[PDB]
Amino acid sequence: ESPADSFLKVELELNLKLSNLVFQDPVQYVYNPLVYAWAPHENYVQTYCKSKKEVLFLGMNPGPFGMAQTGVPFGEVNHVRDWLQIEGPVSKPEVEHPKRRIRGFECPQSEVSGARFWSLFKSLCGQPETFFKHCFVHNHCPLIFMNHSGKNLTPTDLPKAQRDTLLEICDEALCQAVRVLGVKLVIGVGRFSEQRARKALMAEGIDVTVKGIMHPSPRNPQANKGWEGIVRGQLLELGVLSLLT
Amino acid sequence: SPADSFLKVELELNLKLSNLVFQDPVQYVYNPLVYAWAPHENYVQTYCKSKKEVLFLGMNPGPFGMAQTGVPFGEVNHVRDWLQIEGPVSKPEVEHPKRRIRGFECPQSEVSGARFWSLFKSLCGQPETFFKHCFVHNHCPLIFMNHSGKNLTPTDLPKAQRDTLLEICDEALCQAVRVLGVKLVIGVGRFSEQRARKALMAEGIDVTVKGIMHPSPRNPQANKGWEGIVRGQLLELGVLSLLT
DNA sequence: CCCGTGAGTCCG
DNA sequence: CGGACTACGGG
């Protein structure tokens, strides 16, 4: 009963259905680090999904300087290389916007959401085995979208049409991964993810609770004030602190 | 070298460029450093035999000069007759029909190249004299058309296509200027002028960068007495002396 | 070409 | 409510 190989296959399944869609209009570039950063992604899943999980943290999509460069979700380079200890070759999506070049583990920029994310669990837990013992992390959509200028588009900033097909498809995948991991509880990082997961799972009556935490993005002011403080508090109300040690 | 190193720098450059891909408005792309390599390497072999003090730098080829001869500002009469370079020229994989490459048979004369080489002919007489201490090169070797075959400069390109290219063309420029020993770069036009200062100041190269007006007949100021303005600018920058 | 007047983005 | 940076059209 290791989910790794089935998680990875839910993901290659999902890469398939997505390779099929065509985007438009405000969208000019699309990148899926799940193709070009497969190696480190695999290595994450292999090393850290060796067994079934009670909790799943769930973010919305990769950001430009985290998962888009490392393949690990909330994948800020330094914490991924020094704490998770995941290395891997990464190549380059087929068309790059010059302001959003993939440099892999030689990325200079630090993604603030991801560094916050993992810096909390690194304080909470010490050692990655402790945090992954019962938990795991994953994103609802692995694709990353940019307009003509390099400006990032979330899935919600997408026009109606491609947006509903694309979420419909990730919603089904999300249900498989949840079943494969074996989880009792899911914490969306951010409102979009908590809602979306909720609506996904109840639509196939999967019997799992969906809570949330504050997103650590710096576009959100309450987060720049003491994200870790708030969240350590949100995880205590959810009853998960005993889980991570 | 620097003939041989200069060429290695250009062949590393083509290879980065053979990767990229364009679109949108860009429908054709030619590289005369591939189909016109021979007359380009004769040019270099003949006139880049020692280190240099000055580097004239244009922006990119035009449709009837370097696109046809593989020499920078390479208008066919001045190239064959004063510089004395000839060479087989083959053809781009996909030609726009109204811009077929015909090499040293091109009936069109590029006005820019004609002005530019004529000036130096009159100034220096014999090319060996021009190239005792100078050389000429373009920042970018590709040429671009749109569906109708009209020319797009690197400046006419959408931003995303343009930044990738130009940042692959800068490195090259640095490598080139470190290979020739150049102490002065003169951009032929504002665009190369500004582009090369940005670029050499960044690697912190020991080198000045100045500018002369561009000959293109698209520039209204260049249509009356370009030759006479550029002789003035060149006098200020003080290189009339090295030009004998 | 060469320049001027100006919109899109970022400010973690 | 700003400041700095860095597509297109007329000459």
Ligand SMILES: O=c1[nH]cc(CO)c(=O)[nH]1
């Ligand atoms: O800036 C320019 N203009 C025109 C030519 C002609 O081929 C050139 O080589 N460089």
Ligand SMILES: O=c1[nH]cc(CO)c(=O)[nH]1
């Ligand atoms: O003589 C020329 N030279 C250069 C051009 C530029 O495309 C032209 O149209 N006519």
